[PDB]
């Protein structure tokens, strides 16, 4: 019969109502800058399909970040470019400053306005309680904006959040896996990093939506308030779901599978068994209790749900009492 179809609870038809040029990234005509404006200085890091360099813009002495794009599927270069251009100027979105080509290899490279090479993962084990709530709220601003623009990031994790802690500014980066949401579309489940994969990716449910990013955000939050990194620490994609079921319980896992008529891969059958839901208080101890409150546990509980439709949206999340102090102090 097939799996039951699903629709985003929010921003369902934003791309349908856009001019086709907005989301038809394969037809996008790239505006190329001048590679001679920039001099690479040193390598900052490496992705599986990218090389990242610190560089200087010699025309104005500004430091920038240069990302060399090299996906196997050429289609993904225009996808990342078109998403970055559609999102440019939105809150806490990294700003694409230029697009050039390596003069030797002719490989496309993105030029970003500089942010300090310090990600949320290097910082979030030394933050106070208030700073976790502040930066979580800033990430939610970025996610609600990109969701409202029809885009799911699909790779939300601490290494993709750059923070300038001195200036308390935050940028959500690496839009190389981001996609446009279209109702009824079946997407690739081989996205995101293992520890942050939502249950829909692990049980192979393809008609997912923005709510995938909200599961990943819940995984980051649990890691921070509990000082456990990663919070769900599987050895492969099958064990990853087992790690989740040992916390959220198996009853709601199978209710989820029943609801969408999902065919569970037989590799799961021998390793899941039965698990009761563990109350979130079971993870509190003396070295993390200063980060844990009733509002944090209630908020966490509403992000980490098997059923993607039951998870808080980014907008609903920003109204949670967990952020009441941040919202008051912000005005």
């Amino acid at each position: 019969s097939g799996p039951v179809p699903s629709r985003a609870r929010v921003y369902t038809d934003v791309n349908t109502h856009r001019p086709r040029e907005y989301w038809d990234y394969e037809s996008h005509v790239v505006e190329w800058g001048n590679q001679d404006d920039y001099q690479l200085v040193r390598k900052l890091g490496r992705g599986k399909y990218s090389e990242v360099f610190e560089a200087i813009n010699i025309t104005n002495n500004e430091k920038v970040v240069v990302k060399i794009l090299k996906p196997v599927k050429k289609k993904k270069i225009k996808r990342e470019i078109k998403i970055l251009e559609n999102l440019r100027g939105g809150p806490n979105i990294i700003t694409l400053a230029d697009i050039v080509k390596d003069p030797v290899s002719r490989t496309p490279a993105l030029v970003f306005e500089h942010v300090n090479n310090t990600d949320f993962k290097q910082l979030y084990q030394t933050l106070t309680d208030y700073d976790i709530r502040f930066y979580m709220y800033e990430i939610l601003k970025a996610l609600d904006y990109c969701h409202s623009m029809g885009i799911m990031h699909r790779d939300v994790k601490p290494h993709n959040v750059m923070i300038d802690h001195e200036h308390r500014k935050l940028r959500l980066i690496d839009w190389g896996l981001a996609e446009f949401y279209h109702p009824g579309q079946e997407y690739n489940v081989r996205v995101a990093s293992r520890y942050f994969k939502g249950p829909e990716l692990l049980v192979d449910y393809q008609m997912y939506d923005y709510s995938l990013d909200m599961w990943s955000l819940g995984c980051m939050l649990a890691s921070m308030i509990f000082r456990k990194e990663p919070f769900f620490h599987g050895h492969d994609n099958y064990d990853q779901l087992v790690r989740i079921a040992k916390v959220l319980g198996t009853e709601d896992l199978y209710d989820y599978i029943d609801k969408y008529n999902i065919e569970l891969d037989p590799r799961f059958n021998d390793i899941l068994g039965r698990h009761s839901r563990k109350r979130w208080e079971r993870f509190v101890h003396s070295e993390n209790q200063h980060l844990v409150s009733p509002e944090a546990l209630d908020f966490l509980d509403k992000l980490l749900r098997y059923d993607h439709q039951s998870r808080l949206t980014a907008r609903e999340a920003m109204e949670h009492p967990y952020f009441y102090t941040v919202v008051k102090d912000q005005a």
């Binding site: 404006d37 001099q39 690479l40 560089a55 010699i58 050039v100 390596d102």
Partner: peptide, 5 residues
């Protein structure tokens, strides 16, 4: 490398 090297 854009500007030499």
């Amino acid at each position: 490398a854009x500007m030499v090297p």
